[PDB]
């Protein structure tokens, strides 16, 4: 699923991703968190397909209308901005991203279509739609056209459809009524008919799309176009001398564009939600962050109050707000996708001439209304830590409960593959083999699991303790207190032993499996500890040090003389991770030579 530790962003290609990536770069320097900005095609329709399966970006940028459908499906995570932060943005933007009383996304910018015109060609654009035919006429004699804009997305045709009273859904009793659809109303039929009449009269071409309309205006083929703020950049790359003004009226009524609020939602499956929040609130939403995106591609009106006040001075931004006020914010209801899909058809079918305006719009109103559980799998993988080797074991029975078929299990080195013993899957590697990593006094690798259900590999971090890195020493103390002389031992006097390891391992639990004192030939061997417990009345276990160092006490009695001159204390220590099971427990033996005297 989503990669843990990194932020993946999806945004439409027309919007500045480069300016956004430059915001992420600033985020990397301070927090060292790499931000990947991508712009796939059909990210709005692609996101819900992948997100439902757990795959997708950590953050998605789109108009607000799509986020309610995502929300109602459970693909978005409710954002939790502080009241002090919400006041920094205009209240109406928070209304766009509010769903079921929850905030499902962060509003970024307010987007509304405007009329862009060529000043060199047309210093004073027409005030109304009705006079475009008379305009286009004057231009065609010069080998040009009055207006070109994308007819394949109803977003661009809606301003004319809603000018006479066309509407997607009526708002009553505080909610959008999905049974009541305004596509077939005479206001829409009047707008769409006007569009068709422009195509029939040759004033526009039905096949026109976005990239053709953008190429035509920037290259001087047409005097006017309808687009959003994002497009002003490429017009600047071009030398076109242009201006942004309010959309022309229709039947005396202003053109009502559907106003989207560019918003950043957080994936419901993303583990990084905290990072997404820290990035969006602290960095992306700011005077600087928004300016960085605006330099690459214009955002137009912004949700942030402070930065907005500066942007409103821009004539182009003032023109976008003027068009927004005359427009209606898009409903965020899940039904919008069916509405948009249905309206796109009617515009294309009616503009193509395949259907009459009444027949096309009437049909649109009808359509508008309209097992593996691999996360558990990794838990079954057991890490066995031997002295020289690490072995991974996966019980077959447990796998059966999960209903998964494992295609492969390996270490980092693909050469090392698990072997099937028929009751379990075992994978053994030497600490120096299979790309094992020796660091931090630990031997770490990853178990790469491939399941038939998912193409992507599953990775689980495995670790074993490296005892060669650790240094073991045997202390001996005359009293139950720290003392500097461990070398000499005396009979009949209590002796206290402490096992010290450097670098001290606090994470691991220390226990003494066995201890022995070897008096050599003729002296015999005395068993101080066995079976993890003290042996005999002369030995008793003590409490460990503040450090993990274990401790025990023993009393040494000799009946006869000569006393053994020298002896060696042997103690076998067991090391288990506080976070690990017994499988990962490792054992080492420590020896020390000591002088016995009396
Ligand atoms: O055309 C239907 C389409 O309209 C909106 O998409 C806009 C978007 O709001 C703008 O920010 C920009 O990306 O242009 C898009 C049109 O291609 C809706 O947001 C979208 O759901 C809908 O399909």
DSSP 26-59: HHHHHH---EEEE--TTHHHHHHHHHTTT-S-SE
Please give the Cα distance from 82 to 411 (Å, whole number): 45
Please give the Cα distance from 329 to 326 (Å, whole number): 10
Contact 105, 332 (CB under 8 A): no
User: What is the number of the ligand 1 atom nearest to the C-alpha of 65?
Assistant: 19
**DSSP run (H or E) holding 552:** strand 551-554
Question: How many CB atoms are closer than 10 A to CB 500?
Answer: 16
**Which residue is associated with the tokens 């003590």?**
542
Output the CA 260–ligand 1 centroid distance in Å.
8
> Which among 254, 247, 220 is positioned nearest to 235, based on CA atoms?
220
Output the CA 348–ligand 1 centroid distance in Å.
16
**Residue 135 backbone dihedrals phi, psi, to 5 degrees:** -75, -60
**Which residue is associated with the tokens 């299979």?**
434
Please give the Cα distance from 119 to 228 (Å, whole number): 18
Q: Where are the alpha helices (DSSP H) in 333-492?
A: 336-352, 357-369, 374-380, 396-402
Please give the Cα distance from 270 to 56 (Å, whole number): 8
Beta bridge partners of 329: 259
Among 112, 260, 261, say which to mutate for ligand 1: greatest number of ligand atoms within 8 Å of CB: 260
Degrees to nearest 5, angle at CA 532 with 527 and 534:
50
**DSSP run (H or E) holding 568:** strand 566-577
Contact 400, 440 (CB under 8 A): no
Degrees to nearest 5, angle at CA 128 with 122 and 132:
60
Bridge-based pairing of strands 551-554 and 539-541 is antiparallel
> Which among 138, 54, 7 is positioned nearest to 374, based on CA atoms?
54
Cβ(334) to ligand 1 under 6 A? no
Output the CA 63–ligand 1 centroid distance in Å.
7
Helix or strand or coil: residue 308? helix
> Which among 36, 289, 315 is positioned nearest to 302, based on CA atoms?
289
Gapped junctions in the chain, after residues (C–N > 2.5 Å): 370
Measured in residues, the chain has a length of 598
**Residue 255 backbone dihedrals phi, psi, to 5 degrees:** -80, 120
- Distances, alpha carbon 265 to alpha carbons 86, 105, 228, 505, 534, in Å: 16, 4, 21, 43, 62
Among 151, 153, 338, say which to mutate for ligand 1: greatest number of ligand atoms within 8 Å of CB: 153
Residue nearest to atom 17 of ligand 1 (CA): 153
Contact 342, 364 (CB under 8 A): yes
Please give the Cα distance from 342 to 540 (Å, whole number): 84
- Distances, alpha carbon 455 to alpha carbons 70, 406, 451, in Å: 25, 11, 7
Cβ(297) to ligand 1 under 6 A? no
CA 8 to chain centre: 5
Asked if the bond preceding 562 is cis, omega within 30° of 0, the reply is: yes
Bridge-based pairing of strands 471-477 and 424-430 is unpaired
Tokens of 554: 């023993």
Contact 61, 39 (CB under 8 A): no
Question: How many CB atoms are closer than 10 A to CB 114?
Answer: 29
CA 338 to chain centre: 28
Asked if the bond preceding 228 is cis, omega within 30° of 0, the reply is: no
**Which residue is associated with the tokens 């707000």?**
321
Bridge-based pairing of strands 301-302 and 242-245 is unpaired
**Which residue is associated with the tokens 């101080």?**
528
Please give the Cα distance from 198 to 250 (Å, whole number): 14
Beta strands in 202-312 (DSSP E): 222-227, 242-245, 258-266, 301-302
Contact 526, 546 (CB under 8 A): no
Helix or strand or coil: residue 187? helix
DSSP 8-state secondary structure symbol assigned to residue 574: E
Among 43, 111, 155, say which to mutate for ligand 1: greatest number of ligand atoms within 8 Å of CB: 155
**DSSP run (H or E) holding 470:** none
Please give the Cα distance from 306 to 361 (Å, whole number): 43
- Distances, alpha carbon 371 to alpha carbons 73, 128, 367, in Å: 19, 59, 34
Cβ(154) to ligand 1 under 6 A? yes
Q: Where are the alpha helices (DSSP H) in 89-131?
A: 91-96
Q: Identify the experimental approach.
A: X-ray
Beta strands in 119-272 (DSSP E): 145-147, 167-172, 175-182, 222-227, 242-245, 258-266
**DSSP run (H or E) holding 596:** strand 586-596
CA 533 to chain centre: 51
Using the Cα atoms of residue 83, residue 89, residue 92 and residue 95 in order, give the sign of their dihedral: negative
Please give the Cα distance from 44 to 401 (Å, whole number): 36
> Which among 400, 364, 394 is positioned nearest to 379, based on CA atoms?
394
Q: How many helices (H) and strands (E) does the chain have?
A: 18, 33
Using the Cα atoms of residue 173, residue 302, residue 233 and residue 7 in order, give the sign of their dihedral: negative
Cβ(158) to ligand 1 under 6 A? no
State the virtual CA torsion across 413, 419, 424, 429 in degrees, nearest 10: -40
DSSP 8-state secondary structure symbol assigned to residue 510: E
DSSP 8-state secondary structure symbol assigned to residue 128: B
Residue nearest to atom 11 of ligand 1 (CA): 63
Output the CA 271–ligand 1 centroid distance in Å.
28
Q: In the chain, what is the straight-line distance between the N-terminal and C-terminal CA atoms, in Å?
A: 70
Q: Which residues contact 175 (CB under 8 A, 6 or more apart)?
A: none
Burial 269-278 (b: 16+ CB within 10 A, else e): bbebbebbbe
Cβ(63) to ligand 1 under 6 A? yes
Question: How many CB atoms are closer than 10 A to CB 372?
Answer: 16
DSSP codes of every residue in 361-398: HHHHHHHHH----HHHHHHH-EEEE-SSEEEEEEEHHH
> Which among 383, 378, 392 is positioned nearest to 449, based on CA atoms?
378
């Amino acid at each position: 699923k989503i990669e843990e530790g990194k932020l993946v962003i999806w945004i439409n290609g027309d919007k500045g991703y480069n300016g956004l990536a430059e915001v992420g770069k600033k985020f990397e320097k301070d927090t060292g968190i790499k931000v990947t900005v991508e712009h796939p095609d059909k990210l709005e329709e692609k996101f819900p397909q992948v997100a439902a399966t757990g795959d997708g970006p950590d953050i998605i940028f789109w108009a607000h209308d799509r986020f309610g459908g995502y929300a109602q499906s459970g693909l978005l995570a409710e954002i939790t901005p502080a009241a002090a932060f919400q006041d920094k943005l205009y209240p109406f933007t928070w209304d766009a991203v509010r769903y079921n009383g929850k905030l499902i996304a962060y509003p970024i910018a307010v987007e509304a279509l405007s009329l862009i015109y060529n000043k060199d060609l047309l210093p004073n654009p027409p005030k109304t739609w009705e006079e475009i035919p008379a305009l286009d006429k004057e231009l065609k004699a010069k080998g040009k056209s009055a207006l070109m804009f994308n007819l394949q997305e109803p977003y661009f045709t809606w301003p004319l459809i809603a000018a006479d009273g066309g509407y997607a859904f009526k708002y009553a009793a505080g909610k959008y009524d999905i049974k009541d659809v305004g596509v077939d109303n005479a206001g829409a039929k009047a707008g769409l008919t006007f569009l068709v009449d422009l195509i029939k009269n040759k004033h526009m071409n039905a096949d026109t799309d976005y990239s053709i309309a953008e190429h035509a205006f920037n290259h001087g083929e047409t005097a006017m176009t309808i687009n959003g703020p994002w497009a002003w950049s490429n017009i600047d790359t071009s030398a076109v001398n242009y201006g942004v003004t309010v959309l022309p009226t229709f039947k005396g009524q202003p053109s009502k564009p559907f106003v989207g609020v560019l918003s950043a939602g957080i994936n419901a499956a993303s583990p990084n939600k905290e990072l997404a929040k820290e990035f969006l609130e602290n960095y992306l939403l700011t005077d600087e962050g928004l300016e960085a995106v605006n330099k690459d591609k214009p955002l137009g009106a912004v949700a942030l109050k402070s930065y907005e006040e500066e942007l409103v001075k821009d004539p182009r931004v003032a023109a976008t707000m003027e068009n927004a006020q005359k427009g209606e914010i898009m409903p965020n209801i899940p039904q919008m996708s069916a509405f948009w899909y249905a309206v796109r058809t009617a515009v294309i079918n009616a503009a193509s001439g395949r259907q009459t305006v009444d027949a096309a719009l009437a049909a649109a109103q009808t359509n508008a209304a309209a097992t593996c559980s691999p996360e558990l799998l990794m838990s079954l993988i057991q890490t066995k830590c031997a002295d020289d080797a690490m072995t991974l074991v996966l019980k077959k029975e447990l796998v059966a409960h999960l209903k998964c078929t494992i295609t492969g299990l390996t270490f980092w080195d693909p050469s090392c593959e698990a072997e099937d013993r028929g009751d379990k899957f075992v994978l053994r590697s030497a600490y120096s083999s299979c790309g094992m990593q020796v660091s931090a006094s630990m031997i770490s690798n990853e178990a790469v699991v491939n399941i038939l259900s998912s193409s992507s590999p599953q990775r689980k971090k495995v670790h074993c303790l490296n005892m060669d890195s650790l240094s073991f020493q045997l202390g001996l103390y005359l009293s139950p207190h720290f003392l500097q002389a461990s070398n000499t031992i005396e009979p009949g006097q209590q002796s206290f032993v402490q096992v010290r390891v450097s670098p001290s391992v606090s994470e691991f639990l220390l226990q003494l499996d066995s201890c022995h004192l070897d008096l050599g030939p003729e002296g015999g061997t005395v068993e101080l500890i066995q079976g993890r417990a003290a042996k005999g009345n002369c030995v008793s276990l003590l409490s460990p040090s503040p450090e993990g160092d274990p401790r025990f006490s023993f009393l040494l009695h000799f009946y006869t003389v000569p006393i053994p001159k020298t002896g060696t204390l042997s103690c076998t220590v067991a090391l288990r991770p506080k976070t690990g099971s017994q499988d990962q427990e490792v054992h080492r033996t420590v020896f020390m030579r000591l002088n016995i005297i009396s």
